[PDB]
Amino acid sequence: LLIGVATSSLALHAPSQIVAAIKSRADQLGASVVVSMVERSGVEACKTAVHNLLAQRVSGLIINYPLDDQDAIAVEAACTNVPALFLDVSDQTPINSIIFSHEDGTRLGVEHLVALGHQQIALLAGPLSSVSARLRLAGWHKYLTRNQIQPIAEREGDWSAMSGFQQTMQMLNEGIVPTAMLVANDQMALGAMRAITESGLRVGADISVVGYDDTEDSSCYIPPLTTIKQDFRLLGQTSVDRLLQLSQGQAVKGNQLLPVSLVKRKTTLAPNTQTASPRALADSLMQLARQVSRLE
Amino acid sequence: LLIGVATSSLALHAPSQIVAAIKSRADQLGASVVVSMVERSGVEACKTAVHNLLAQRVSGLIINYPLDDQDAIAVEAACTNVPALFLDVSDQTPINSIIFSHEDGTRLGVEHLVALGHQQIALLAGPLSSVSARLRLAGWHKYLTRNQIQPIAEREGDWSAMSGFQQTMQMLNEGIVPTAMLVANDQMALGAMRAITESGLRVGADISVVGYDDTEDSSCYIPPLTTIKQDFRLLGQTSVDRLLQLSQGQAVKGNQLLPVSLVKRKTTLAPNTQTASPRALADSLMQLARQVSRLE
Amino acid sequence: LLIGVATSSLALHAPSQIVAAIKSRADQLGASVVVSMVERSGVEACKTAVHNLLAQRVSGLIINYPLDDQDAIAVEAACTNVPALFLDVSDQTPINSIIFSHEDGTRLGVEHLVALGHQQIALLAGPLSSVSARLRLAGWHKYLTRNQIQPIAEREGDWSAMSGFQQTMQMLNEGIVPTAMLVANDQMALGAMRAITESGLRVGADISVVGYDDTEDSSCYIPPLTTIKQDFRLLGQTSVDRLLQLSQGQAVKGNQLLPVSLVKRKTTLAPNTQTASPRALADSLMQLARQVSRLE
Amino acid sequence: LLIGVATSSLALHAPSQIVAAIKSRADQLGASVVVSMVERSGVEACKTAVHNLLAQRVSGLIINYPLDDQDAIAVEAACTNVPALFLDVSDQTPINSIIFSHEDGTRLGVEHLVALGHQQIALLAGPLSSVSARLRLAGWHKYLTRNQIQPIAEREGDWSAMSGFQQTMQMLNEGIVPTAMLVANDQMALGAMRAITESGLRVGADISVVGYDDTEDSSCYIPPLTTIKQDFRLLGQTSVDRLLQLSQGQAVKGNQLLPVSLVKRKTTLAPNTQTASPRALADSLMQLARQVSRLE
Ligand SMILES: CC(C)S[C@@H]1O[C@H](CO)[C@H](O)[C@H](O)[C@H]1O
Ligand SMILES: CC(C)S[C@@H]1O[C@H](CO)[C@H](O)[C@H](O)[C@H]1O
Ligand SMILES: CC(C)S[C@@H]1O[C@H](CO)[C@H](O)[C@H](O)[C@H]1O
Ligand SMILES: CC(C)S[C@@H]1O[C@H](CO)[C@H](O)[C@H](O)[C@H]1O
């Protein structure tokens, strides 16, 4: 009983909250989990990661890493005879896998904003060289389409807070001031939020943001982020588990999806990028002047 | 060579970021790394990961886990005839250790705080279990004192955003309102922030905050966290290198302290009991500008 | 396969960008390119180049050089067998050409200034030797009368920046001061901008300028300029596709016009005469805010 | 006597100004210049570029493309017997090549600021995968270090007018505010120049920028660039000329250096006007608030 976990960059919270979640279930079942982090590169990076664990004489493999249909299949055979469960793959590729409904994920985000009266929605996607990053972009460009609305913007980030921050100062330094944004994860929305703020914009009221994952700090990110949840606590549960099932005789086989949901919090409101004021705002500015000349 | 790591919960940013770095360095030297995850509960928890990692015939062992003066010893003996490096222990311990200066980290934090005219300072510590936690709490006590200052409050967290949040919300609600707050880590600092905001107070202008760590996301928090940088990257390469040196008997024995540095950003600023509309005001004309434009 | 391109001066931005574009499209289908630098000398030069690329045994020729009707007719005669494709000609020439709608491109530019309330409009053309420049000056002329205006000034640059400069500040020196200037290409607009500024006016607020091309750097001229966007990347791609199929029996033939668009930015504003409030304020308020967050 | 020219991206101004000269020169001797291109791949891309040209019976080969010491050496062999002149290389890579003085170009930048009284300078370097950019970063260090100063920042761009904008949005938003920047190319200066302005700073008077290359548009940028002139005409010339000489048995086989210069203009002043953020700011916020006041 020695579960091998070939995971992402543990810098990112998700691949981390997942491992914690894994190590946690293997705990009660009474099995041992052993991590092997895997490089930024791809396919072959993952392969060696795989080989290591194979050497430790692991029992089965949970591959938490981005792979294209083709790559996934490669890696599977790399494992030779050990049963390997895949966590970040197309919900189409043959291999055994557990995926969060990328279809429901986007559908919810999209429809929540539309109902809220938003029309000018901008998209901040993850690193398009990542299947999961790719499948949410798709679902965005579908559920907004079926709703008739079209994305006034589209950026590419990389799962970091800074990435979401730059791509949002960029988008705003050239004229696209929307009323809502669909971000590919919670860290990018964190940065995205500071962005929208250092710009005189009220997050939520002026620009509604909706993260995606609902990692831990998301509750405390200033406006407690309205985010789509991915229960990794329960993803590891089902994972370690099914992994046992495949090895110890049977299985279930191939694609198996889990649900997601809209954790409605505080970054999403009626469009109204604020309307009105006569010379009320003139009277406002007026005082700051006193204040400023109150200084020099 | 094969490096083994006993680690705290991979879900805490700092530990995840310290694990990720140790990775990079093993990578540059053609060495594999395997991580055993531990349940921050006790010394036994620790002896296990070690004990299983010592079954992998790992070449070096790195124990990044909060062991006590006497526990460390139990664990060093546990990691039989293999060199181990302890990362969360005390320089006050006869084990091969590499740690960050707690004496400076706390020194600066106070030094910076008193330097801006703050006198009523509140302390928000981490789980008093962590040697480190307790260490950081010793320092703040030492330096506030050398500045004839005694803290007006001292709550305790558990290293997470939500504890930083629950704790200040309680303090604040208790009539206790500081003018500057010293937090044990960036994460809890996120929480304290949100609380300080929901209390209707300008974080920076009214209550200045100083985390301690400079984990990734901090450059993107609300007003970016003025915070004690612990160079996890630095910590990474050293341990890895020294672990080889270690196997080869190269007596890089005993303790050795890495430095911290105060990163200035947007949460520290003088006590708002001086001038009014400091820094902020600027980014108030910004809001107003962004309202007037909305009307044309 | 192997395409040849007889080009205008490579030192002129748009033609360079078009070549770079054509290069990519070639690459996409694995077509080899080869460029011949044509001297502004004239059709006897653009003829030699045609003859030189024929020496190489090109499969198809793209000719982006500003030839005149009979000058175009004369060069195709020289395109023995190999199919030539003309980029700089008039839709009116009975050869195979692909160009950008000089109609809409001059239409919008005018409509944009008329709808902004301008009326004293000055024109800055390119060298009247070229069809394209003259094609552009014809439009401006048509729409201004059709919108009951007649340019108050009409100068002639040569596509370079310095022309835009000299020419404008020259007109400015004769005391001919307009509220809007239409310029034949971005480069010249860069220059005009400096002349304007250098002679004491706020480009935009006082004299507004439109461009034509939206070449690379345009996003960065201090006030980024509103300009007629011509997609050279599209041009480049079609050029090849057409040339291929064309040259490959599948006779396309004739002339096809590509669409353009008005890229709105910071140089086009309402006339200063009317309140100087077109905007001013939102743009102003905001950067004053940044100097208000610089002394505290 | 046919000269094959394997050039870089022609999107950039310098490689295009050099081709223009390359032809302009070859034009005088009664020689043909056939331009071939390379993407940003490296060696293989530069080699195909070379095999292509070899096909057309080119008698010369001018490689104006970034090659690493041993990569140059490969492409030379690739180049075969047909004599090759390299334009982008290091003075100590063993082949016949003409390069501007990276040593004096950086020396002049440095000494100019130092003597002007600049202490805090930032470094906007070019893509560190381009020898030009590298020897040019190193050079600046040497002279600054020689002068007792160290870069308060060091960013990396990619030669476009936009990377200049983002790295100055960046380096500035993250608090660094130098008083001089040594930019590694004139296009990247239009962005820094534009960034430094949109942040309430006066280029020249507040941040002092100094570009590199001095290309055609630089004398028309807003405050016209104090730049380092690389005489692209003298280079085109010396290039072709020397090219027919080695072709014709002669030599001086290996390194050859041309001079650089400092074209002083208006982006460099003595550090400070004292206050870009003073009293007026409130009086000015007033008339604004009042210019506001009336659109309601
Ligand atoms: C593992 C990274 C690609 S990041 C990570 O993966 C998770 C599970 O796939 C979720 O996708 C998160 O949104 C994303 O941040
Ligand atoms: C596992 C916790 C002690 S968290 C973590 O560990 C790091 C390494 O020592 C530092 O202690 C960080 O402050 C702390 O946040
Ligand atoms: C062919 C150049 C002399 S000019 C160049 O060409 C483009 C494509 O035709 C456009 O005509 C540009 O405005 C002009 O600068
Ligand atoms: C092709 C690029 C390196 S751009 C270009 O190259 C010339 C080569 O000498 C110069 O070095 C310029 O500084 C740079 O912008």
Side-chain angles (χ1 to χ4, degrees):
Chain A
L1 314 153
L2 197 64
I3 301 162
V5 179
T7 190
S8 281
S9 185
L10 260 33
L12 296 175
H13 312 359
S16 299
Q17 283 195 210
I18 291 175
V19 287
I22 306 283
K23 144 74 195 164
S24 181
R25 188 78 195 322
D27 256 348
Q28 35 206 310
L29 274 47
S32 194
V33 161
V34 55
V35 164
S36 196
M37 265 209 50
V38 67
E39 300 62 89
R40 221 285 181 198
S41 188
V43 200
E44 238 83 13
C46 182
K47 299 184 175 201
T48 261
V50 180
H51 289 88
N52 275 10
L53 310 170
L54 278 158
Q56 286 64 288
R57 305 147 78 223
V58 294
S59 308
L61 310 156
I62 284 178
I63 289 86
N64 189 341
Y65 187 87
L67 287 319
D68 292 313
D69 272 83
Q70 270 323 284
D71 298 329
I73 302 154
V75 190
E76 165 158 60
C79 320
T80 67
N81 76 263
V82 303
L85 196 241
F86 279 81
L87 284 190
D88 194 351
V89 281
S90 304
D91 76 282
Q92 224 84 326
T93 317
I95 90 275
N96 303 268
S97 66
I98 301 195
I99 303 301
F100 300 84
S101 189
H102 51 89
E103 193 66 32
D104 270 319
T106 30
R107 199 187 71 41
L108 275 147
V110 174
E111 292 196 34
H112 180 72
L113 286 178
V114 174
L116 265 171
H118 291 283
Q119 222 137 16
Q120 301 166 236
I121 300 164
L123 299 189
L124 205 195
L128 261 277
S129 66
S130 150
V131 229
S132 27
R134 200 173 289 134
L135 300 207
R136 303 164 191 196
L137 181 46
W140 280 333
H141 272 109
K142 172 173 175 171
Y143 288 100
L144 288 154
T145 290
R146 303 286 172 68
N147 249 147
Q148 235 89 92
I149 283 178
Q150 223 56 292
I152 56 165
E154 184 165 350
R155 324 298 296 218
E156 190 167 351
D158 63 347
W159 306 135
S160 63
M162 257 305 152
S163 180
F165 180 77
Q166 307 166 153
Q167 297 293 138
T168 305
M169 84 129 263
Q170 288 178 186
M171 179 226 278
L172 291 188
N173 257 56
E174 79 182 348
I176 310 176
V177 211
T179 34
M181 295 197 57
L182 297 193
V183 206
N185 82 4
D186 290 350
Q187 288 178 240
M188 276 188 286
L190 200 209
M193 276 165 87
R194 174 169 141 261
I196 297 177
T197 312
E198 325 248 86
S199 303
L201 268 340
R202 280 188 243 149
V203 34
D206 296 343
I207 297 182
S208 294
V209 184
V210 186
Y212 189 113
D213 270 330
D214 184 54
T215 32
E216 279 205 90
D217 314 322
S218 294
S219 311
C220 297
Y221 279 165
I222 30 302
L225 180 67
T226 288
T227 166
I228 296 315
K229 202 192 165 71
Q230 294 215 320
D231 188 340
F232 319 100
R233 207 224 75 88
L234 173 142
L235 156 75
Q237 191 274 101
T238 321
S239 281
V240 188
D241 259 345
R242 187 203 219 186
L243 170 59
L244 271 37
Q245 294 173 178
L246 297 132
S247 82
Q248 194 192 10
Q250 273 57 71
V252 187
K253 301 293 293 298
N255 176 43
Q256 182 176 310
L257 297 311
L258 287 173
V260 292
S261 53
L262 180 80
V263 184
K264 201 175 304 196
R265 280 198 191 100
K266 286 275 198 166
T267 49
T268 47
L269 259 71
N272 169 62
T273 352
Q274 265 289 21
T275 44
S277 172
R279 49 173 256 59
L281 47 62
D283 252 330
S284 302
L285 274 178
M286 265 293 330
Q287 252 107 107
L288 297 89
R290 246 78 303 315
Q291 286 308 94
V292 188
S293 281
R294 169 104 147 75
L295 291 15
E296 82 312 291
Chain B
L1 151 142
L2 180 55
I3 291 169
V5 195
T7 182
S8 290
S9 192
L10 256 318
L12 270 153
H13 306 350
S16 313
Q17 224 173 281
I18 295 183
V19 173
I22 296 177
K23 172 58 175 177
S24 160
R25 198 47 148 104
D27 273 6
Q28 283 181 29
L29 311 190
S32 309
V33 161
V34 135
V35 195
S36 208
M37 266 206 64
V38 298
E39 297 113 287
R40 220 291 295 292
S41 70
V43 72
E44 236 82 79
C46 214
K47 289 172 50 65
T48 310
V50 179
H51 266 75
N52 300 195
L53 273 186
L54 248 171
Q56 313 294 311
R57 296 138 86 288
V58 77
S59 171
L61 240 178
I62 295 186
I63 322 283
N64 166 34
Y65 186 76
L67 289 332
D68 259 349
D69 254 301
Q70 192 63 225
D71 293 329
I73 308 161
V75 195
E76 179 187 79
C79 46
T80 48
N81 68 268
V82 276
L85 268 181
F86 284 81
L87 273 43
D88 186 340
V89 293
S90 179
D91 42 355
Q92 313 150 154
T93 318
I95 41 198
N96 324 351
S97 61
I98 305 186
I99 65 178
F100 275 99
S101 194
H102 52 130
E103 214 94 20
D104 294 313
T106 52
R107 178 176 67 65
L108 273 165
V110 167
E111 278 220 300
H112 180 36
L113 264 316
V114 200
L116 288 124
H118 291 286
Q119 312 277 244
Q120 290 101 295
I121 292 175
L123 305 179
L124 167 56
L128 286 184
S129 304
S130 221
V131 198
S132 322
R134 265 191 275 111
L135 280 171
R136 299 166 191 199
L137 206 242
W140 301 338
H141 259 314
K142 200 217 292 216
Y143 301 92
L144 294 157
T145 239
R146 316 300 219 56
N147 292 117
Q148 279 55 219
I149 302 303
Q150 298 296 356
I152 58 139
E154 163 213 306
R155 318 314 269 208
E156 179 191 314
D158 71 86
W159 295 132
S160 67
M162 202 67 93
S163 40
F165 170 42
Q166 237 52 228
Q167 244 54 64
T168 355
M169 209 66 248
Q170 291 180 188
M171 161 172 98
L172 289 165
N173 282 316
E174 265 167 44
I176 302 157
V177 168
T179 73
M181 257 201 52
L182 255 161
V183 199
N185 83 347
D186 288 18
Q187 281 177 89
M188 298 193 288
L190 207 202
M193 249 121 91
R194 164 189 151 144
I196 292 163
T197 284
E198 307 202 351
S199 294
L201 305 174
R202 303 178 286 153
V203 39
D206 284 10
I207 300 185
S208 333
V209 163
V210 158
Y212 183 118
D213 247 351
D214 199 65
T215 3
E216 214 89 277
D217 291 358
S218 315
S219 55
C220 274
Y221 277 168
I222 327 160
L225 250 194
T226 305
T227 173
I228 291 310
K229 209 187 201 297
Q230 294 207 134
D231 202 321
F232 301 133
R233 227 186 322 107
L234 177 60
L235 180 52
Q237 76 198 44
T238 327
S239 323
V240 178
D241 280 346
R242 198 221 201 155
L243 187 60
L244 312 197
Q245 254 145 282
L246 254 283
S247 75
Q248 298 176 163
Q250 274 342 275
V252 190
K253 307 186 169 184
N255 150 56
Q256 52 147 131
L257 282 82
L258 299 184
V260 305
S261 27
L262 165 56
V263 338
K264 232 72 60 60
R265 289 194 183 107
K266 295 172 189 177
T267 47
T268 47
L269 183 132
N272 88 283
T273 152
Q274 301 146 243
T275 213
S277 306
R279 180 57 193 58
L281 211 176
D283 289 61
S284 295
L285 289 157
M286 275 289 226
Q287 236 129 47
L288 226 167
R290 199 73 63 148
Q291 260 61 88
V292 106
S293 65
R294 248 56 170 272
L295 72 70
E296 61 175 52
Chain C
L1 184 99
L2 171 90
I3 311 180
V5 182
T7 185
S8 307
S9 194
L10 228 332
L12 264 191
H13 295 6
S16 316
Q17 233 160 263
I18 294 176
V19 186
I22 292 181
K23 175 54 184 294
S24 296
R25 192 50 207 227
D27 297 0
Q28 228 119 77
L29 321 206
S32 276
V33 86
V34 90
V35 204
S36 225
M37 293 282 325
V38 180
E39 295 88 51
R40 279 172 73 161
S41 299
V43 93
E44 218 78 69
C46 187
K47 176 76 149 295
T48 307
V50 182
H51 288 117
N52 285 240
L53 298 171
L54 265 158
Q56 317 306 308
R57 299 173 89 150
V58 276
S59 304
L61 273 210
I62 288 180
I63 300 187
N64 177 353
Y65 191 59
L67 295 339
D68 277 82
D69 264 70
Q70 268 289 340
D71 286 338
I73 315 288
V75 171
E76 204 173 39
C79 288
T80 20
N81 171 5
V82 292
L85 206 49
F86 291 81
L87 270 307
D88 199 339
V89 286
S90 106
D91 46 355
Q92 301 115 187
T93 303
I95 40 170
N96 289 357
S97 56
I98 307 177
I99 67 176
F100 282 106
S101 190
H102 54 114
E103 208 71 63
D104 308 316
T106 52
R107 181 179 61 83
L108 303 151
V110 173
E111 285 191 318
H112 183 89
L113 300 206
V114 151
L116 257 165
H118 288 289
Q119 279 149 71
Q120 305 314 306
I121 297 166
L123 314 193
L124 177 67
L128 308 167
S129 331
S130 75
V131 251
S132 35
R134 261 189 283 116
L135 233 2
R136 270 165 238 191
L137 189 282
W140 294 350
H141 256 180
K142 161 154 53 173
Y143 300 91
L144 294 175
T145 87
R146 294 247 304 253
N147 263 114
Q148 281 72 347
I149 302 150
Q150 244 31 270
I152 55 142
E154 199 165 284
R155 292 294 185 237
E156 173 202 36
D158 71 324
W159 302 137
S160 85
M162 204 53 70
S163 68
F165 176 34
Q166 305 282 42
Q167 232 58 230
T168 307
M169 145 297 244
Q170 227 147 243
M171 172 213 308
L172 294 178
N173 268 187
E174 287 170 31
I176 284 185
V177 174
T179 54
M181 272 200 88
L182 278 148
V183 189
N185 87 339
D186 280 355
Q187 290 179 244
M188 291 191 270
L190 201 215
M193 291 204 223
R194 178 191 149 200
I196 294 176
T197 308
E198 213 104 327
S199 289
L201 297 312
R202 294 172 292 151
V203 27
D206 300 70
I207 306 184
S208 324
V209 357
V210 188
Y212 207 125
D213 274 341
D214 191 59
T215 19
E216 213 74 80
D217 303 349
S218 302
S219 320
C220 295
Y221 292 170
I222 70 315
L225 74 182
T226 310
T227 170
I228 296 310
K229 211 251 187 301
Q230 302 197 129
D231 197 301
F232 299 122
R233 178 195 299 94
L234 185 62
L235 181 63
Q237 152 215 138
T238 322
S239 316
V240 182
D241 291 352
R242 227 252 249 214
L243 179 77
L244 288 166
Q245 63 187 132
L246 191 172
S247 66
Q248 297 328 284
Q250 220 330 103
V252 197
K253 301 157 179 166
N255 139 50
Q256 54 184 120
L257 282 75
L258 272 53
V260 288
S261 94
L262 169 52
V263 176
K264 284 169 276 63
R265 282 184 176 101
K266 300 305 151 221
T267 53
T268 58
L269 218 82
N272 123 83
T273 66
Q274 41 143 69
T275 68
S277 309
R279 177 48 59 64
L281 330 182
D283 277 308
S284 305
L285 295 198
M286 276 185 286
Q287 35 76 73
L288 253 310
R290 299 149 178 270
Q291 301 167 287
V292 173
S293 49
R294 212 171 279 302
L295 18 42
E296 56 176 354
Chain D
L1 310 70
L2 215 197
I3 304 174
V5 187
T7 193
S8 291
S9 160
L10 280 195
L12 300 175
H13 308 4
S16 304
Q17 282 194 212
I18 289 162
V19 172
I22 290 287
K23 178 46 155 182
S24 201
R25 208 315 105 116
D27 231 46
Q28 273 165 75
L29 299 353
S32 189
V33 171
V34 62
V35 170
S36 199
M37 290 139 101
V38 197
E39 292 65 69
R40 190 59 244 210
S41 337
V43 196
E44 251 55 26
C46 195
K47 283 163 74 177
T48 300
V50 166
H51 295 99
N52 249 234
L53 286 170
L54 263 30
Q56 287 73 285
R57 307 152 305 184
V58 297
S59 328
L61 272 170
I62 305 207
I63 321 283
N64 168 38
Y65 183 88
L67 276 314
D68 302 80
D69 263 84
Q70 277 283 355
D71 280 339
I73 296 172
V75 113
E76 158 180 267
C79 189
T80 311
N81 48 43
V82 250
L85 222 305
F86 296 82
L87 293 198
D88 219 349
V89 269
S90 172
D91 59 305
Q92 263 284 207
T93 318
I95 63 211
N96 330 259
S97 52
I98 305 182
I99 68 185
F100 298 88
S101 177
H102 47 86
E103 208 85 53
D104 291 57
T106 41
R107 186 174 65 53
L108 300 177
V110 182
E111 276 168 44
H112 187 52
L113 299 177
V114 174
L116 216 40
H118 285 291
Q119 216 93 253
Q120 308 170 255
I121 308 159
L123 278 223
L124 169 62
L128 275 300
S129 42
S130 159
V131 217
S132 312
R134 274 197 271 128
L135 310 201
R136 223 177 280 187
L137 207 182
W140 283 322
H141 278 148
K142 187 180 188 158
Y143 294 82
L144 284 161
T145 241
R146 238 55 160 192
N147 276 113
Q148 299 257 77
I149 311 173
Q150 287 307 83
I152 68 172
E154 186 193 295
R155 314 304 309 219
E156 173 168 338
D158 68 341
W159 304 131
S160 74
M162 191 59 71
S163 58
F165 193 76
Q166 309 171 149
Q167 308 279 158
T168 302
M169 115 195 160
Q170 283 164 217
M171 176 257 278
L172 274 190
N173 280 1
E174 159 220 57
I176 305 155
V177 179
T179 47
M181 303 195 46
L182 280 191
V183 179
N185 149 279
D186 280 64
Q187 273 178 272
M188 287 198 295
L190 231 190
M193 277 199 63
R194 187 181 140 246
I196 303 163
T197 309
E198 314 214 297
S199 308
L201 264 23
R202 304 142 84 141
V203 21
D206 291 350
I207 315 313
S208 283
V209 196
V210 164
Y212 208 107
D213 279 349
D214 185 78
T215 42
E216 276 295 290
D217 301 331
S218 304
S219 54
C220 287
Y221 283 174
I222 277 301
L225 257 174
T226 285
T227 158
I228 283 141
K229 171 60 164 288
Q230 296 208 128
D231 196 332
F232 303 110
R233 289 170 282 98
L234 169 58
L235 166 65
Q237 185 222 123
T238 53
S239 290
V240 183
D241 287 312
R242 174 170 176 205
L243 171 62
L244 313 178
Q245 296 196 230
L246 60 139
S247 163
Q248 254 80 269
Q250 293 352 299
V252 94
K253 27 175 55 197
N255 196 47
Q256 191 164 336
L257 282 253
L258 301 177
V260 150
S261 53
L262 191 87
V263 328
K264 177 186 299 61
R265 288 185 196 121
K266 285 81 71 72
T267 48
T268 56
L269 305 190
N272 113 138
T273 185
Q274 189 229 58
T275 197
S277 319
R279 171 161 259 199
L281 306 192
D283 313 78
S284 319
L285 277 157
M286 262 130 66
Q287 63 186 31
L288 208 30
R290 284 303 171 192
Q291 208 195 113
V292 164
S293 294
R294 206 50 277 229
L295 38 291
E296 329 85 286

